Amino acid sequence: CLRRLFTRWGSFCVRNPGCVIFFSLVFITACSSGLVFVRVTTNPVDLWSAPSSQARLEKEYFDQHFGPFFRTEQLIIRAPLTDKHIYQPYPSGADVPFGPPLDIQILHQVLDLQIAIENITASYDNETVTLQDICLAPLSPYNTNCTILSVLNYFQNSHSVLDHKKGDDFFVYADYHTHFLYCVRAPASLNDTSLLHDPCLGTFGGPVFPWLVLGGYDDQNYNNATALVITFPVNNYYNDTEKLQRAQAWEKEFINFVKNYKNPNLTISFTAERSIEDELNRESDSDVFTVVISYAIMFLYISLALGHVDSKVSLGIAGILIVLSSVACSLGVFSYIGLPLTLIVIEVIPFLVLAVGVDNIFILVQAYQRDERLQGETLDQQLGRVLGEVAPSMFLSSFSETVAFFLGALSVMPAVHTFSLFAGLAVFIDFLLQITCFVSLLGLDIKRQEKNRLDIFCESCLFRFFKNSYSPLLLKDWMRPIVIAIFVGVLSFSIAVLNKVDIGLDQSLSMPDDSYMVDYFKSISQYLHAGPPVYFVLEEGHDYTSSKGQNMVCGGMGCNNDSLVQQIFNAAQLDNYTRIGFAPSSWIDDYFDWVKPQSSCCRVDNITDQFCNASVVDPACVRCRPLTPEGKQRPQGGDFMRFLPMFLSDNPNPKCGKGGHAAYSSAVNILLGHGTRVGATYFMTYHTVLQTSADFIDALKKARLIASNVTETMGINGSAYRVFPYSVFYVFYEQYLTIIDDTIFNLGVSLGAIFLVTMVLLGCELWSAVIMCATIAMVLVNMFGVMWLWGISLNAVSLVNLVMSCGISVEFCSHITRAFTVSMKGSRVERAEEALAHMGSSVFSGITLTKFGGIVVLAFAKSQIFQIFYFRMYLAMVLLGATHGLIFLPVLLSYIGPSV
Numbered sequence: 001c002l003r004r005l006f007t008r009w010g011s012f013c014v015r016n017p018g019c020v021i022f023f024s025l026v027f028i029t030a031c032s033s034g035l036v037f038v039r040v041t042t043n044p045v046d047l048w049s050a051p052s053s054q055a056r057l058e059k060e061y062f063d064q065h066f067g068p069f070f071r072t073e074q075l076i077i078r079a080p081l082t083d084k085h086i087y088q089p090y091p092s093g094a095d096v097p098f099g100p101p102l103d104i105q106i107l108h109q110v111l112d113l114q115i116a117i118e119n120i121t122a123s124y125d126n127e128t129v130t131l132q133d134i135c136l137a138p139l140s141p142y143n144t145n146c147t148i149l150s151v152l153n154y155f156q157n158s159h160s161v162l163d164h165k166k167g168d169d170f171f172v173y174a175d176y177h178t179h180f181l182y183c184v185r186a187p188a189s190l191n192d193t194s195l196l197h198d199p200c201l202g203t204f205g206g207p208v209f210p211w212l213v214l215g216g217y218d219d220q221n222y223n224n225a226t227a228l229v230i231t232f233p234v235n236n237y238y239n240d241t242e243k244l245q246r247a248q249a250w251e252k253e254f255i256n257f258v259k260n261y262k263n264p265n266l267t268i269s270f271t272a273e274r275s276i277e278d279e280l281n282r283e284s285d286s287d288v289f290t291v292v293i294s295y296a297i298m299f300l301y302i303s304l305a306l307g308h309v310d311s312k313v314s315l316g317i318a319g320i321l322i323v324l325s326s327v328a329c330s331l332g333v334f335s336y337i338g339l340p341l342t343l344i345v346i347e348v349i350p351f352l353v354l355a356v357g358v359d360n361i362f363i364l365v366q367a368y369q370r371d372e373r374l375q376g377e378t379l380d381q382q383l384g385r386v387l388g389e390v391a392p393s394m395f396l397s398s399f400s401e402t403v404a405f406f407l408g409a410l411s412v413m414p415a416v417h418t419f420s421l422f423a424g425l426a427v428f429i430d431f432l433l434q435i436t437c438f439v440s441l442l443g444l445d446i447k448r449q450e451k452n453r454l455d456i457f458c459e460s461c462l463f464r465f466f467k468n469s470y471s472p473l474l475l476k477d478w479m480r481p482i483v484i485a486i487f488v489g490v491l492s493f494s495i496a497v498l499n500k501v502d503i504g505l506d507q508s509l510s511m512p513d514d515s516y517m518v519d520y521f522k523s524i525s526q527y528l529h530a531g532p533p534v535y536f537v538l539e540e541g542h543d544y545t546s547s548k549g550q551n552m553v554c555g556g557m558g559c560n561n562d563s564l565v566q567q568i569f570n571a572a573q574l575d576n577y578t579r580i581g582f583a584p585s586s587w588i589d590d591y592f593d594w595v596k597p598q599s600s601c602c603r604v605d606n607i608t609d610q611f612c613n614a615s616v617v618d619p620a621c622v623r624c625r626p627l628t629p630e631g632k633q634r635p636q637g638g639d640f641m642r643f644l645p646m647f648l649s650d651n652p653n654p655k656c657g658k659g660g661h662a663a664y665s666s667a668v669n670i671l672l673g674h675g676t677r678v679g680a681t682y683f684m685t686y687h688t689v690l691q692t693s694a695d696f697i698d699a700l701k702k703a704r705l706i707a708s709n710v711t712e713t714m715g716i717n718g719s720a721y722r723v724f725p726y727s728v729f730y731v732f733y734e735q736y737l738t739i740i741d742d743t744i745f746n747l748g749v750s751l752g753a754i755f756l757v758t759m760v761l762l763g764c765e766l767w768s769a770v771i772m773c774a775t776i777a778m779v780l781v782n783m784f785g786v787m788w789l790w791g792i793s794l795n796a797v798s799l800v801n802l803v804m805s806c807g808i809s810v811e812f813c814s815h816i817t818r819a820f821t822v823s824m825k826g827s828r829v830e831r832a833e834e835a836l837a838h839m840g841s842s843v844f845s846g847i848t849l850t851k852f853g854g855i856v857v858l859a860f861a862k863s864q865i866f867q868i869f870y871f872r873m874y875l876a877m878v879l880l881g882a883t884h885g886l887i888f889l890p891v892l893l894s895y896i897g898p899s900v
């Protein structure tokens with residue numbers, strides 16, 4: 001039926017070509033109008049996460065009480081030019097060694113450097129920004145000293161306490177070696193036991209646990225350390241753009257300072273939480289020139305290879321501008337609606353629309369070239385008749401592609417969702433502006449060609465032959481079998497080695513050639529002993545103010561054995577398996593060890609009933625919990641809620657402990673209502689060393705396994721609350737937990753669409769379709785085989801290029817399958833030969849441009865992500881699809897093709 005519409009409308013475009021060029025122009029301008037309007041290129045690195053994914057819902061929950069996870073700037077600083085030294089104690093005998101970085105004159109230099117960094121000036125909003133402004137001080141009143149994780153916080157960042165020495169000039173009863181050896185074993189104390197005194201706390205960045213500052217030490221003896229780790233945590237509050245940016249500026253001066261810092265006594269590594277999203281943007285420039293010159297070669301070929309100085313140069317340029325017009329239109333309307341225009345979309349979309357649109361251009365133009373007008377036939381009748389001969393094919397392919405991509409936007413991997421929207425529309429708009437504006441400006445170049453005026457100013461060429469000779473050899477029953485054998489061999493190969501495909505991005509690979517983050521990843525895998533931290537979160541609803549409520553969560557001292565912190569501790573004994581690193585560091589156990597009557601920590605005034613200090617003189621401040629036998633037991637009743645806010649207001653006092661303001665302040669949520677209640681909580685620990693792309697995934701899986709294992713044991717009946725873990729990266733690496741099923745779903749959905757449209761549209765009869773769909777399945781399976789053979793991973797980028805791949809293979813298989821299915825020659829081999837000579841000779845010119853671009857793409861692409869993912873998968877899709885469409889599909893139709 002469509003033949004009437006495409007014929008009559010083609011005649012229309014030939015008669016009156018003004019209304020269609022002008023109509024289409026109004027369309028284009030109307031969409032590009034929205035282009036520059038929005039053009040919001042998303043870039044926060046949660047674009048790899050789904051807004052409904054359990055990981056991002058968990059993040060949106062953890063942002064309720066601690067808000068965001070802090071930015072982290074780190075330094076692995078090591079001493080290369082200083083040998084070890086030996087500490088011999090005095091009365092007791094137990095010699096200890098001290099590694100290179102633990103020399104004292106070095107620790108002085110580390111202190112001068114850390115003080116220099118501790119105050120760096122930066123300009124934001126035409127103002128001035130200091131570290132103290134933006135780093136988190138766990139006590140906004142009291143001392144606003146900033147958290148700073150170094151071994152030097154054992155010595156309170158002062159050279160006096162470092163050079164402390166107790167003993168006469170000759171012997172040394174207890175120097176800094178003894179203080180260090182004491183703190184690394186109990187870093188939550190305010191009073192050393194060796195000297196008269198000192199404190200193992202610091203400039204109050206909390207109790208400096210020894211694993212976050214030491215590196216390269218063997219096992220438990222930290223003294224054998226070989227590198228110092230220094231961690232500055234800075235606030236993040238993603239919920240704001242004002243101050244996050246000034247933080248980014250402070251880091252921007254920071255990095256330049258550390259890089260331009262000479263100290264031959266030390267070799268340094270470091271990291272700002274923007275360094276990745278910075279050097280990555282740096283690498284996203286090395287290829288741009290190569291991409292543009294690639295498009296110059298494709299454009300140039302398109303201009304040249306058209307027709308037999310009457311070259312259709314202006315026609316090729318025009319069709320190009322129509323394709324670019326289609327891209328700008330799609331990005332336009334979708335921007336208008338509000339679609340974050342990601343970068344991968346900028347790499348894929350113009351390549352796609354350029355390839356397919358160019359193919360349509362060649363089908364049409366070449367179709368007219370091989371046609372010769374009849375006796376008294378007219379231009380309207382001729383170009384209209386050809387437009388009918390071809391149009392339902394271009395509409396078939398482009399339509400199945402559009403519904404395929406659009407239907408592809410159904411998953412939640414956002415990189416493929418945004419893509420499938422943009423492309424799913426851009427293909428359609430390309431077909432509109434292509435069958436309307438392009439053909440109507442094709443009649444113009446026709447009349448110019450027949451009135452002898454030059455194209456730019458004012459038979460059958462070759463590949464018709466080349467395919468009239470290629471088409472017979474390929475399917476003389478002498479050779480048919482051989483071809484089927486080759487393709488079944490390759491397909492069997494890929495079927496075999498598709499399982500051993502690598503899941504996940506190799507973060508060390510994604511960095512520029514000689515960036516600094518590479519040395520940072522290596523120096524992490526070498527020395528470091530702790531990984532990212534995890535916040536085992538207990539949601540609202542737990543009793544807490546009860547025996548069985550505490551024992552379900554409390555740790556040790558009669559607190560079950562399946563309790564939460566007992567679960568994380570037992571899970572930490574096997575660190576290199578259950579990737580849970582170290583001790584859990586609970587609040588409720590410290591609270592219990594704080595209200596304790598034997599402590600003089602908690603005291604309330606006898607007469608104002610207000611909480612007395614731990615350091616105050618207490619004339620009348622009596623103890624919170626009496627020294628009865630029952631009073632020494634944990635606060636079971638509402639007294640729990642009575643004293644808990646005082647603990648979370650209490651501060652480090654040398655007559656008491658670290659108090660709750662230290663770290664459990666921003667950890668315990670006190671819900672106010674019907675008295676009081678305890679909301680959500682967390683138990684901060686640290687993952688083991690995570691380096692491999694499989695490491696992170698294993699850590700997330702096992703951590704959530706601990707979450708569920710605890711949740712069943714908390715005797716809970718229903719989704720009233722769970723115990724999920726949060727970390728920096730669970731958001732980024734939860735997407736790999738379902739990549740298998742999401743890939744299968746998406747490719748099966750695109751295949752279901754293409755098969756449906758090819759079934760119903762291309763008349764009927766399945767076999768016409770099922771042959772095509774099956775051939776596409778071959779294209780994808782062999783594509784996976786290339787991934788394995790060429791070392792290509794299976795992340796969101798490669799997946800996007802797979803969806804696109806199944807997209808463009810339709811441009812090969814579809815026009816051939818149509819040209820075959822609607823034909824009446826004396827043999828099936830005849831129809832396959834013709835369908836391979838007419839359409840095939842044109843599809844092969846919707847190829848050699850993308851191949852002649854795949855050439856130059858490699859020749860200077862520096863980004864190894866580009867060389868590995870985009871170039872290699874592009875090459876595999878073009879050669880693989882082309883061979884599977886112009887070599888295999890004819891032979892297959894020559895035996896199973898339908899008969900008419």
Ligand SMILES: *[C@@H]1O[C@H](CO)[C@@H](O[C@@H]2O[C@H](CO)[C@@H](O)[C@H](O[C@H]3O[C@H](CO)[C@@H](O)[C@H](O)[C@@H]3O)[C@H]2NC(C)=O)[C@H](O)[C@H]1NC(C)=O
Pocket residue numbers: 094095096097218221223224
């Ligand atoms: C890692 O740490 C352990 C312990 O801190 C180191 O073992 C110690 O090695 C040195 C010897 O070079 C000494 O500090 C100490 O041994 C002394 O005492 C005995 C007394 O009989 C004598 O036999 C010793 O070898 C030496 O005189 C060791 N201490 C212990 C507890 O074993 C170990 O060498 C360190 N390794 C590295 C690579 O630094």
Ligand SMILES: *[C@@H]1O[C@H](CO)[C@@H](O[C@@H]2O[C@H](CO)[C@@H](O[C@H]3O[C@H](CO)[C@@H](O)[C@H](O)[C@@H]3O)[C@H](O)[C@H]2NC(C)=O)[C@H](O)[C@H]1NC(C)=O
Pocket residue numbers: 217218219574575576
């Ligand atoms: C899991 O944790 C450790 C992390 O890899 C792993 O390594 C052990 O600890 C250190 C390296 O961190 C090394 O142990 C060293 O101890 C002796 C002293 O007897 C030293 O002379 C040598 O350095 C020795 O290699 C080892 O590399 C290794 N082994 C031991 C015994 O400590 C642990 O092995 C892992 N443990 C478990 C239970 O999984």
Ligand SMILES: *[C@@H]1O[C@H](CO)[C@@H](O[C@@H]2O[C@H](CO)[C@@H](O)[C@H](O)[C@H]2NC(C)=O)[C@H](O)[C@H]1NC(C)=O
Pocket residue numbers: 143145157203204
């Ligand atoms: C953070 O606070 C502690 C105490 O609240 C500071 O320790 C004091 O340091 C200054 C020296 O510059 C003097 O007030 C005293 O020598 C210290 N007092 C005590 C009680 O130790 C610490 O210096 C502060 N942080 C920084 C970076 O100065």
Ligand SMILES: *[C@@H]1O[C@H](CO)[C@@H](O)[C@H](O)[C@H]1NC(C)=O
Pocket residue numbers: 082105106264265
């Ligand atoms: C550190 O370097 C300075 C100057 O290069 C030098 O004077 C000092 O001795 C070095 N430190 C040590 C422990 O040698």
Ligand SMILES: *[C@@H]1O[C@H](CO)[C@@H](O)[C@H](O)[C@H]1NC(C)=O
Pocket residue numbers: 115118119120
């Ligand atoms: C930065 O502040 C530190 C103390 O916080 C001080 O020692 C240092 O001199 C300051 N830097 C400058 C350039 O004034």
Ligand SMILES: *[C@@H]1O[C@H](CO)[C@@H](O)[C@H](O)[C@H]1NC(C)=O
Pocket residue numbers: 126127
């Ligand atoms: C920043 O603001 C001050 C006062 O508003 C002004 O004097 C100064 O010139 C500004 N900075 C620059 C670089 O102009």
Ligand SMILES: *[C@@H]1O[C@H](CO)[C@@H](O)[C@H](O)[C@H]1NC(C)=O
Pocket residue numbers: 191192196197198654
């Ligand atoms: C540490 O404890 C000892 C023993 O009671 C005491 O003499 C000393 O003053 C304490 N240190 C501080 C800083 O109070």
Ligand SMILES: *[C@@H]1O[C@H](CO)[C@@H](O)[C@H](O)[C@H]1NC(C)=O
Pocket residue numbers: 561562
């Ligand atoms: C807790 O104790 C029971 C027996 O009392 C034991 O079967 C169980 O395994 C223990 N918990 C763990 C985590 O092993």
Ligand SMILES: *[C@@H]1O[C@H](CO)[C@@H](O)[C@H](O)[C@H]1NC(C)=O
Pocket residue numbers: 613614615651652653
């Ligand atoms: C309570 O203790 C804090 C910290 O130990 C101290 O700064 C404050 O002065 C004390 N309260 C009073 C009223 O002195």
Ligand SMILES: *[C@@H]1O[C@H](CO)[C@@H](O)[C@H](O)[C@H]1NC(C)=O
Pocket residue numbers: 606619620621622
């Ligand atoms: C507390 O007050 C009571 C009366 O309210 C008095 O009998 C008692 O001696 C006081 N004790 C202290 C330690 O102040």
Ligand SMILES: *[C@@H]1O[C@H](CO)[C@@H](O)[C@H](O)[C@H]1NC(C)=O
Pocket residue numbers: 562567709710712713
């Ligand atoms: C985890 O759950 C299993 C049964 O689902 C239970 O037997 C076990 O005690 C729980 N705790 C562990 C394994 O620590």
